[PDB]
Each structure stands twice: as structure tokens, then as C-alpha cells.
Amino acid sequence: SGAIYVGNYRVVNRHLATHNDWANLVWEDSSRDLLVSSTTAQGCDTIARCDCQTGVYYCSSRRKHYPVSFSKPSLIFVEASEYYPARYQSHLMLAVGHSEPGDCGGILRCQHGVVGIVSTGGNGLVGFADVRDLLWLDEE
């Protein structure tokens, strides 16, 4: 689990969104595994605006931060999940590293701020849902 808090926005994995997330929906994309809900409290997190391909992610299944190299956001096919059908995910970045079902929402960050959240795992790979193209997160 995990979320991004920027301004009056909460970013979570779409498959982990709560009833309150959906009751306060700003935006969701099934193809990206993202949902954004509105918050009353102001968020502190800064979204990276950059093309970094290196950063650090939090891995809850190891209680560790790992530095990773990752691919640019792409349409990637993702193998079977106990949350989704095996299918295409857009705006996904892959790295070599550890990711298990509870690692979703772990934040990937570079020097510019938050890059994305853990969305996929298995086969020694970790997939991150990119948020850097969501420029609208930085106003209203």
C-alpha cells in the first residue's frame, strides 16, 4: 500500500482505491492503474517534472529503499495478478528489483521528487505507474 499527497490530491493504485477515494474521484485510468481523489488537508509531496531513468523506490516486502534504473513510461504487457486480468498497462516503467502484491503504492523518487508508484511485480521486475505527465496535479 501507499499514496502520493500533493496539494488537495491523493494518488493511489486504482486497484487499492477505497470507497472514500471513489466518493471523491478527480480522475482514474484503468489502463494506468491510477486513481486521484480530492483531500481537505494540503499535501506536502512534490511531483518530479523530468526524464530521469534512475531513482530510489520503497519496497515494503523488504522494508528497504532500493536504487533502480527504469525504462521510460511505455505500454507494457503485465503477467497474471490477483487484482487484474493479465493485460496491457500504459505509462508503466520497469526496473530489475523486488516487488510483491503488497509493495503497490511504494514511491519511486529522483532528485526532482516523486516519479511514480509501484503497480506491478514478479519475474525479478518491478513496474512503476508514472505520474510525471500529470502536470495538473501541481495546481487546484
Q: Which residues are tagged catalytic?
A: 15, 33, 104
CB of 102 to Zn ion, least distance (A): 26
**Near Zn ion by CB under 5 A: residue from 50, 62, 69, 133:** 50
The response to whether 44 counts as a known ligand-binding position is: no
CA 114 to chain CA centroid, Å, is: 9
52 close to 110: Cβ distance less than 8 angstroms? yes
44 counts as binding ligand A1ANC under rule CB under 6 A: no
26 counts as binding Zn ion under rule CB under 5 A: no
Per-residue burial over 88-112, b if 16 or more Cβ lie within 10 Å, else e, is ebbbbbbbebbbeeebbbbbbbbee
CB of 67 to ligand A1ANC, least distance (A): 34
CA distance linking residue 26 with residue 110, whole number of Å: 26
Residues that bind ligand A1ANC (CB under 6 A): 17, 19, 22-23
